[PDB]
Design an enzyme around this catalytic site. Structure first.
Site, PDB file in Angstrom:
ATOM      1  N   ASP A 151       0.825  -1.211   0.000  1.00 21.63           N
ATOM      2  CA  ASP A 151       0.000   0.000   0.000  1.00 21.63           C
ATOM      3  C   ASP A 151       0.857   1.259   0.000  1.00 21.63           C
ATOM      4  N   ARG A 165      -1.052   9.179   0.242  1.00 26.33           N
ATOM      5  CA  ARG A 165      -1.894   9.275   1.429  1.00 26.33           C
ATOM      6  C   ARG A 165      -1.438   8.355   2.553  1.00 26.33           C
ATOM      7  NH1 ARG A 165      -5.817   8.580  -2.468  1.00 26.33           N
ATOM      8  NH2 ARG A 165      -7.004  10.212  -1.378  1.00 26.33           N
ATOM      9  N   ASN A 166      -0.498   7.448   2.288  1.00 29.20           N
ATOM     10  CA  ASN A 166       0.048   6.563   3.305  1.00 29.20           C
ATOM     11  C   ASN A 166       1.403   7.026   3.826  1.00 29.20           C
ATOM     12  OD1 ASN A 166      -2.221   4.928   2.898  1.00 29.20           O
ATOM     13  ND2 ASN A 166      -1.170   3.668   1.366  1.00 29.20           N
ATOM     14  N   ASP A 173       1.175   3.187   7.544  1.00 23.84           N
ATOM     15  CA  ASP A 173       0.135   2.264   7.091  1.00 23.84           C
ATOM     16  C   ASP A 173       0.739   0.923   6.657  1.00 23.84           C
ATOM     17  OD1 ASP A 173      -1.332   4.614   7.490  1.00 23.84           O
ATOM     18  OD2 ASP A 173      -2.736   4.128   5.874  1.00 23.84           O
TER      19      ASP A 173
HETATM   20  C1  LIG Z   1       0.143   3.381  13.501  1.00 26.80           C
HETATM   21  C2  LIG Z   1      -0.263   4.750  13.023  1.00 26.80           C
HETATM   22  C3  LIG Z   1      -0.793   5.665  13.922  1.00 26.80           C
HETATM   23  C4  LIG Z   1      -1.168   6.929  13.488  1.00 26.80           C
HETATM   24  C5  LIG Z   1      -1.011   7.279  12.153  1.00 26.80           C
HETATM   25  C6  LIG Z   1      -1.423   8.635  11.694  1.00 26.80           C
HETATM   26  N1  LIG Z   1      -2.463   8.918  10.867  1.00 26.80           N
HETATM   27  N2  LIG Z   1      -2.489  10.313  10.713  1.00 26.80           N
HETATM   28  C7  LIG Z   1      -3.509  10.973   9.859  1.00 26.80           C
HETATM   29  C8  LIG Z   1      -4.386   9.895   9.236  1.00 26.80           C
HETATM   30  C9  LIG Z   1      -4.356  11.907  10.714  1.00 26.80           C
HETATM   31  C10 LIG Z   1      -2.808  11.759   8.758  1.00 26.80           C
HETATM   32  C11 LIG Z   1      -1.549  10.986  11.376  1.00 26.80           C
HETATM   33  N3  LIG Z   1      -1.181  12.278  11.537  1.00 26.80           N
HETATM   34  C12 LIG Z   1      -0.134  12.594  12.319  1.00 26.80           C
HETATM   35  N4  LIG Z   1       0.611  11.689  12.981  1.00 26.80           N
HETATM   36  C13 LIG Z   1       0.353  10.364  12.909  1.00 26.80           C
HETATM   37  N5  LIG Z   1       1.111   9.466  13.584  1.00 26.80           N
HETATM   38  C14 LIG Z   1      -0.788   9.931  12.068  1.00 26.80           C
HETATM   39  C15 LIG Z   1      -0.487   6.363  11.250  1.00 26.80           C
HETATM   40  C16 LIG Z   1      -0.110   5.097  11.686  1.00 26.80           C
END
Ligand SMILES: Cc1ccc(-c2nn(C(C)(C)C)c3ncnc(N)c23)cc1
Ligand SMILES: Cc1ccc(-c2nn(C(C)(C)C)c3ncnc(N)c23)cc1
Lengths: 280, 280
Positions: free
Chosen positions: B143, B147-148, B161
């Protein structure tokens, strides 16, 4: 294979006759936009419709869900079930042309609130009639929840999201199964440990739907982790009685949450029960 | 079974030492909120972190993805990979405590735009180093998309992700496979018809990631239906050259989109290529 869509001429609608408009919503269900369809299902003018399509980042499983929703909607036809008008499956993206529920989803409609208890019993009554029809059609909905119900014009309930539906008797030689796509807090207890989804399991989900209505879009089992929900339900524990709920209404929820599926009522009996609450 | 989470004492963090705050995002990935953790990974004060959790309407598969993300993050450790700090797996919901990327996801960061072409090559360079590390760790990301990726403090890339990641060699006797959960426009051609995901398939996804960066968060293959993308890619057709893209940058994308996976470059070579663009 798996990507080519068969063109059903009974449901195929010209793409030039469709005017896509503003987006009504997007998420783990697809992309839904408001639209207008000229000379639809016969002729005579234009019709306000809604169009479902894949997102720009769609996965092959989301195409399976859109085709499954397309296939099921061809067969069902009920005033309290969302109505399929047509589709555009050739020379471009796959668009499902269905009804238009202007008040949006039910959970969003309940949270936006002037509703008395009389309308809530009516809402549950209309959904119970649609499930009655779907049960007679030998169909299991599985994903029966408030966010999957649509409030249409006249504040009338429309059952939607048939992407995870199944027949009561599997009529295929090899069906490959999706696994664990139903939210835990709506899954019946036999679906939790035995992966069993029947009409009686939809009655369990209907009991959770009753709770969502009387609480005006509440979150079932608040704060409880879904990992501990199974051990909690296995010991006969259920949800407590909400505020705006009569003693007869909460008794119906517990019957839908019985341990043995044979002890749960059928939708034909639930409709007669909810109608009596409207009379009294 | 399947719902009980094993308590790893190396990663377990007290729930009272965690102060959950505002929500940073929610969708088909879980719920991510900003938080603060006192006396984390050693001690000495508090730390600004992010916490991932299940939604109120989570399905069992979303718990599988959260546990898979938890499991993979225990093993990896790289400056350009998101860092796992701890978790709360007992006496309540399952919370993953990781780093905090204040600029959010990459696609959101690119669409918010003062970025020159020098930063874009640096962004692709940092991601290429993280994939280099993940390839040496015998891990397939699958993936890999904009966006990841997370943009952290200092505008530094953090791969995220890992819920759909796999080992290069399956080390389990019976693994039950998710099917069709990768967005089509990022899937390699061999993954499209043969369901094959390798490190060379992540290189294909990296080429689409390069396109997302040079277009500042563009939608790959605009308007093309994903059903016709397979027949289009099978005949050697690829994406046209974007605007802000040099001849050397677009040549790297085509090498990542070669028909034969053996003809595609490796991340060790891509890092040396992107670094030369920074020098010139
Ligand atoms: C295991 C894990 C935990 C949180 C995230 C994550 N998602 N997202 C968004 C989706 C809000 C951009 C984040 N934004 C800032 N810091 C982060 N850490 C994240 C990703 C993976
Ligand atoms: C097949 C199909 C197509 C569209 C919809 C649908 N989703 N939604 C949202 C999600 C915006 C409430 C709608 N809002 C109004 N009218 C509708 N018809 C829909 C449901 C099923």
């Amino acid at each position: 294979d798996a990507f080519k869509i068969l063109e059903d001429p009974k449901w195929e609608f010209p793409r030039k006759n469709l005017v896509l408009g503003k987006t009504l919503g997007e998420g783990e269900f697809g992309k839904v936009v408001k639209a207008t369809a000229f000379h639809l299902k016969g002729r005579a003018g234009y019709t306000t419709v809604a169009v479902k399509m894949l997102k720009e980042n769609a996965s092959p499983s989301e195409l399976r869900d859109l085709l499954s929703e397309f296939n099921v909607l061809k067969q069902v036809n009920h005033p309290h079930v969302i109505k399929l008008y047509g589709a555009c499956s050739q020379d471009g993206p796959l668009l499902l042309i269905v009804e238009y529920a202007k008040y949006g989803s039910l959970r969003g409609f309940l949270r936006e609130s002037a509703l008395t208890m009389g309308d809530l019993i009516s809402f549950a009554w209309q959904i119970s009639q649609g499930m009655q029809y779907l049960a007679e059609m030998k169909l299991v909905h599985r994903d029966l929840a408030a966010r999957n119900i649509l409030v249409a014009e006249g504040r009338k309930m429309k059952i939607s999201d048939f992407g995870l539906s199944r027949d009561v008797y599997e009529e295929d030689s090899y069906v490959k199964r999706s696994q664990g796509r139903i939210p835990v807090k709506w899954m019946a207890i036999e679906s939790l440990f035995d992966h069993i989804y029947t009409t009686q399991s939809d009655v369990w989900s209907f009991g959770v739907l009753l709770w969502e209505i009387v609480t005006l879009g509440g979150n079932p089992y608040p704060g409880i982790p879904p990992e501990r929900l199974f051990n909690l339900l296995k010991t006969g524990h259920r949800m407590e009685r909400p505020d705006n709920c009569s003693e007869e209404m909460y008794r119906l929820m517990l019957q839908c949450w019985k341990q043995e599926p044979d002890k749960r009522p059928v939708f034909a009996d639930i409709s007669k029960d909810l109608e009596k609450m409207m009379v009294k």
